Design an enzyme around this catalytic site. Structure first.
Site, PDB file in Angstrom:
ATOM      1  CG  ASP A   1      32.231 -24.467  51.945  1.00 41.15           C
ATOM      2  OD1 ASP A   1      32.331 -25.507  52.623  1.00 41.15           O
ATOM      3  OD2 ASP A   1      32.540 -24.404  50.734  1.00 41.15           O
TER       4      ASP A   1
ATOM      5  CG  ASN B   1      36.644 -22.478  51.450  1.00 38.95           C
ATOM      6  OD1 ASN B   1      35.506 -22.941  51.566  1.00 38.95           O
ATOM      7  ND2 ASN B   1      37.340 -22.569  50.322  1.00 38.95           N
TER       8      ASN B   1
ATOM      9  CG  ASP C   1      34.234 -21.180  48.506  1.00 39.16           C
ATOM     10  OD1 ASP C   1      33.303 -20.706  47.812  1.00 39.16           O
ATOM     11  OD2 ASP C   1      34.334 -22.394  48.790  1.00 39.16           O
TER      12      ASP C   1
END
Ligand SMILES: Nc1ncnc2c1ncn2[C@@H]1O[C@H](COP(=O)(O)OP(=O)(O)NP(=O)(O)O)[C@@H](O)[C@H]1O
Length: 280
Positions: A138, A143, A160
């Site tokens: 991700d 992030n 994250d």
């Protein structure tokens, strides 16, 4: 694995909300015994096995297990974990300087050197993770958080780990889909996934860092995903006319459909430019 079941309020005081996510809220906190500050991530548990709300215990435990492994300047560390009937509470290292996403929105136009300064730290963090066979899955500007946004060359940490997986057999086959704008074609096509998917996302981040524009973004999620699968991007002259051809070469070698042909993290660090959720 069970976690500490004492009330987290007996040990911490919470303050400002730092962000929120898929069934989670993150609050700035202070540990009573030391005065040290952290980010408390409250993850909502599933109330029943077949429920679609909350995060499965398997998924929570994976995130915690991966976080427990990592210690590197460019990643977030885990301090402690608590739980109660409704939440698992991860006491994480605080990153106080906001998301790279918000930094980019407020500034609007990086130099190649500014972009490289961010990207080198991202590459160092990902090198560490991939050396441990951890795929993040991700990676995106939301992030990547800044320690202090008010210095000329802000330091960053990757956050994250809610989709991160150990890749001990070269690839994983689930059940894994990040944000449409940033996912690799193999994600879009529900194919086995490995460390290569992160390298694609790094290509997308690099394109955004240099231009302020997103390479595959359509007006709907389905359009973005179709664009990703078809490798439907180009370098717009309006955005890239004063960007070096070497920078474009770097991006071109990451935004490659066949994961086997894509640059690895080690390749990216040796590259001459560098070397010194899915449904509507
Ligand atoms: N260590 C940290 N320090 C400061 N802020 C943080 C930290 N970790 C998370 N945040 C903020 O909280 C938000 C949500 O945390 P995150 O760990 O991404 O949860 P999530 O539920 O996995 N989000 P999503 O990927 O959308 O499902 C982030 O986007 C950050 O803005």
């Amino acid at each position: 694995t069970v976690f500490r079941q004492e009330n987290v309020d007996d040990y911490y005081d919470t303050g400002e909300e730092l962000g929120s996510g898929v069934f989670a809220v993150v609050k700035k906190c202070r540990e009573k015994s030391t005065g040290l500050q952290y980010a408390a991530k409250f993850i909502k548990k599933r109330r029943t096995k077949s429920s679609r709300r909350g995060v499965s215990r398997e998924d929570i435990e994976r995130e915690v297990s991966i976080l427990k492994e990592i210690q590197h300047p460019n990643v977030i560390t885990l301090h402690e974990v608590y739980e109660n009937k409704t939440d698992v509470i991860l006491i994480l290292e605080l990153v106080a300087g906001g998301e790279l996403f918000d930094f980019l929105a407020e500034k609007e136009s990086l130099t190649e050197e500014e972009a490289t300064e961010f990207l080198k730290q991202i590459l160092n963090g990902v090198y560490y993770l991939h050396s441990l066979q951890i795929a993040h899955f991700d990676l995106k500007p939301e992030n990547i958080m800044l320690l202090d946004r008010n210095v000329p060359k802000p330091r960053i940490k990757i956050i994250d780990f809610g989709l991160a997986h150990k890749i001990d057999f070269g690839n994983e086959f689930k059940n894994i889909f990040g944000t449409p704008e940033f996912v690799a074609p193999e994600i879009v096509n529900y194919e086995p996934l490995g460390l290569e998917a992160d390298m694609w996302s790094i290509g997308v981040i690099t394109y955004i860092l240099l231009s302020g524009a997103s390479p595959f973004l359509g007006d709907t999620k389905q359009e973005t995903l179709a664009n990703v699968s078809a490798v439907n991007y180009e370098f717009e002259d309006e955005y890239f006319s004063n960007t070096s051809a070497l920078a474009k070469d770097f991006i071109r070698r990451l935004l490659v459909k066949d994961p086997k042909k894509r640059m690895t993290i080690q390749d990216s660090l040796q590259h001459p430019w560098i070397k010194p959720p899915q449904f509507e």
